[PDB]
Write a protein that binds this DNA or RNA. Structure first.
Lengths: 396, 397, 395
DNA sequence: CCATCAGAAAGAGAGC
DNA sequence: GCTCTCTTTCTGATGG
DNA sequence: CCATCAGAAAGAGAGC
DNA sequence: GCTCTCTTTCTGATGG
């Protein structure tokens, strides 16, 4: 079983986790937490079954232990162990070598080499998840190889997606299906850590792709005419779910009262054309302006209403559409065309405009907003020409 | 059984390694260290199973041994042996010939003529390395031949590379597959004498290569365009083997996903152009588990990602292409041309940029990151010129 | 059997033996030589069976070989192979490490581990020789061990002695009496490289040596008076054992009859002092040469009479006693000191003579033979000064 | 840093 | 007796 | 609705 | 070349 170290050994707390409901070997629903220590030469893992010791398990703190257990190399300190706060003259010196080694996550190829029954600790990016009835196969993967993780009990069907840093605590290796599988035990724990960030502009495809996508109205443009023959009215809008954002082309302006910012909507028939979500009828927008939902975690906000960088545009496919705000400094007018020379702190370029938008009155010395301009380039310099669904307006 | 020498014999300690752990005859995990001693007439290789004698096995120290074993012409000392420091009046003087002839490694061809089970000792050159799943085979070669060595267990893929100088301690000859091999033993030990770096630029080319190669990306950049007429995509990257490093060009932007730093990759049917290696189809990379246990050298990383000095650039043959980072201090724009005089802690030069990359706004005080630039010069200094595959970006504080 | 290497390979010749007789596989005696050649990455041993290639197989020559054979990893050249003369722009740069490994001998401890029939080359010191009726056992030794070498036929009872160097080419391995031995084969060769008789001045010591040392008298001086007051007489002699030479000061001149060149004598109860050997009484020496065969090698004879070069003397410790023959250039005399300028190709110094030896007539152009002079120096140069035991003469 | 390797320089044996 | 040369040796050199 | 701060990880230095 | 540690950077996180 688990041997017993009875010598008063001095240690220092490196890391720890929060109390969480576990199932003790007595079929109760108690609470426990994890932690790691480090002596003058080595480091240990620690299980804590007594939840009243959470104070002395703060990091950068020294404590002396006696009458503690040791199972499979892991120290076990329960409700019958001695954990006392050390004195200023009872501190051990841990070099900055055991510290950077304790928190090192192993390689998966080396998990495929061990014997059955051992314990592991580490964080891994998730490759693919496959939910089953009572467990789930979490395929974690790093540069060293792939392996399977089986999760049942309290960790069956947990809130995570394909790409989360799954920090794992106390898992047993098992030879299942002739391949290395990793199953949990009884003292296990999983803290989830998603690195959620995505700039650029999400472009959902699939034509006739109907359904729901109850997003949130963010920034919108006033309506305008884009076909002077038939006086067709439209306006662009940028909206976002909690995961992504979408640039919307609205062709029925009666939803101007429903495309007000800071509003939440669930919108139906959408056709993924040129990366835009093109609505063709107001009947796809329920007001629903009394039922909350999202919050959009700040960083998504600025991401959606980001103003791109000319350096970033030099690296996009010649045919993609833009939306940003930039400073003008030049202006030449040639036969019905108006070239607006612009640039920022990264690069400069030309912006050509032809058609109705010549009626825009602007001169160097004030900023300018752009929406839905194609990306082109010549031998001389790059360009962002005015297309059919274009729009622009000068600011303060 | 072995033989037992129960009489005092004086020796002079020559070489002595550091303590290392082994699996003793009782399959316990004990400590031992190797040592080479020499009498006035004959030298002797010696084993030390009692690590407490660590101080009395120092070079230039004379000792006397009593009640010590010996096997295959090699002395042994465990816990049941008496080793005593010899006083300065008990000095024996071992000539310089035993010193030059103890560290002399036996020629390989003569190792190809020893009996099955014989034990050897010598430093040799790593000509090619190969790691199995169980053991690890090392093909060594010198002026007399080649021979493979089986390193299983404690010697299953160590920390070394081709071109080093590995010191083999106590490896046994065994006819495997018709040819001799050096299999591991109970008292095996290997200490290294590293060498080889290959800094400077990458390597040469093999036009329309038919072979394969496994490296690891070290510095990838963003994609871009090098042709304005027909929209042609490409991006630069840095890759490396265990020993060599290479700066690569990729023209099918699709292979931007497979080209990530720290990614072990694989490349086949590749072209070579002016120090850079050209790929043309996505059917050349398969980042699907080629070798997980590959260890890249930190100095190699710092050499491939290295940025040369202006003085060093002066000593290069013009025609080689430049990559790295420098700082700007002058800015002079003329007709559709912009000049950026860069400088470092050795001097200053010029950078001539033309065309599309003139649409970038760099200013003195911010660092400029150049990749793939020609190296030209005139009577009035040196330049880095922007060519068909030039790339750069601005980074500041 | 052997395998055949068809492709041209360019090599630099490292070594070659003189030609020697051997028996061919068809039972005919012919000449062959052994060579060692190298490429830029590897060395090879080569057996050369076509003696017309003698001039091509010369050291530091570059040659191009094709249609050659391999047996046990060693190359073989017969009448069917081609060996041409490389052009100057076809030379190769052979690393010195390769020459080092090719000229290196295997250790005996590793030879003893060899499989039966393995072929070896190397140079080893002979420790013991036993000559039987039909073969000879040469027990050789190096720092790693000893092994017996069995020679027969041509290599039976060759003219060598313990201490000589034997260069062995292409000997095979055979187990005899459970002990590994080396044995001669079809292509074996031996070359002898002197022995181990190299002097380096006598030894010191000082205790009353009660032992004897049957030495041969090499050189002697006429008796002379080294103390004028009491008329004390002595002479100097150089003598040699077989491996060593010693300088003897004889203070009992009755031994003059016993010290004659070529006579062999036994010296007992002698005293080392200041690097010389001393004989205080006539009973220490007997005229009987009870070892008529004593042999003093020419290397030891010539080396024992050698006069040290002056520049070499500049490096010697002050206070040592020196004997040598030097050419006299300048002669000046001041208040009973005589200053004789002497010199050789290495340099120039002064011989300072005081007292009785000032009666020796010497003028510029004469050559001075000095025995037992003290080496000293001043700020202006180096001198050889006459002392109590000094002797000198003009030749 | 840890000891190796290499060009230069000194020492031994054969020959004119 | 002198000279050419193979052998042996010390210290500067390499390297990342 | 926005800026500052902080822990981790890649890159570099002193010394072995 | 190898190792401990000082330095620099990208990105996720805080709050009145």
């Amino acid at each position: 079983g688990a041997v017993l170290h009875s010598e008063p050994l001095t240690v220092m707390v490196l890391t720890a986790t929060d109390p969480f409901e576990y199932e003790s070997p007595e079929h109760e629903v108690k609470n426990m937490l994890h932690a790691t220590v480090a002596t003058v030469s080595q480091y240990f893992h620690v299980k804590v079954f007594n939840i009243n010791l959470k104070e002395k398990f703060t990091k950068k703190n020294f404590i002396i232990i006696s009458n503690y257990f040791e199972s499979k190399g892991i120290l076990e300190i329960n409700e019958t162990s001695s954990v006392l706060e050390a004195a200023p003259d009872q501190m051990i010196e841990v070099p900055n070598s055991i510290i950077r080694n304790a928190n090192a996550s192993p390689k998966i190829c080396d998990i495929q080499k061990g014997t059955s029954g051992a314990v592991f600790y580490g964080v891994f990016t998730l490759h693919k998840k496959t939910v089953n009835r009572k467990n789930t196969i979490y395929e974690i993967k790093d540069g060293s190889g792939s392996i399977e993780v089986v999760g049942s009990g309290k960790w069956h069907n947990i809130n995570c997606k394909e790409g989360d840093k799954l920090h794992l605590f106390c898992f047993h290796l098992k030879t299942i299906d002739r391949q290395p599988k990793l199953v949990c035990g009884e003292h296990s724990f999983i803290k989830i850590s998603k690195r959620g960030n995505v700039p650029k502009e999400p472009a959902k495809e699939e034509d006739h792709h109907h359904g729901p996508k109850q997003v949130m109205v963010l920034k919108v443009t006033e309506p305008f005419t884009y076909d002077l023959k038939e006086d067709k009215r439209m306006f662009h809008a940028t909206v976002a779910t909690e995961t992504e954002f979408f640039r919307v082309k609205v062709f029925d302006t009666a939803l101007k009262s429903k495309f007000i910012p800071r509003n939440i909507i669930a919108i139906s028939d959408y056709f993924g054309c040129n990366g835009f979500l093109e609505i063709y009828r107001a009947s796809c927008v329920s007001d629903v302006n009394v039922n909350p939902t999202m919050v959009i975690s700040n960083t998504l906000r600025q991401r959606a209403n980001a103003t791109p960088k000319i350096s970033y545009l030099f690296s996009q496919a010649r045919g993609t559409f833009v939306s940003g705000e930039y400073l003008v400094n030049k202006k030449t007018e040639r036969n019905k065309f108006i070239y607006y020379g612009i640039g920022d702190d990264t690069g400069k370029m030309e912006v050509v405009v032809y058609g109705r938008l010549t009626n825009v009155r602007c001169e160097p010395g004030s900023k300018l907003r752009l929406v839905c301009f194609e990306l082109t380039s010549t031998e001389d310099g790059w360009q962002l020409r005015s297309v059919r669904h274009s729009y622009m307006q000068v600011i303060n």
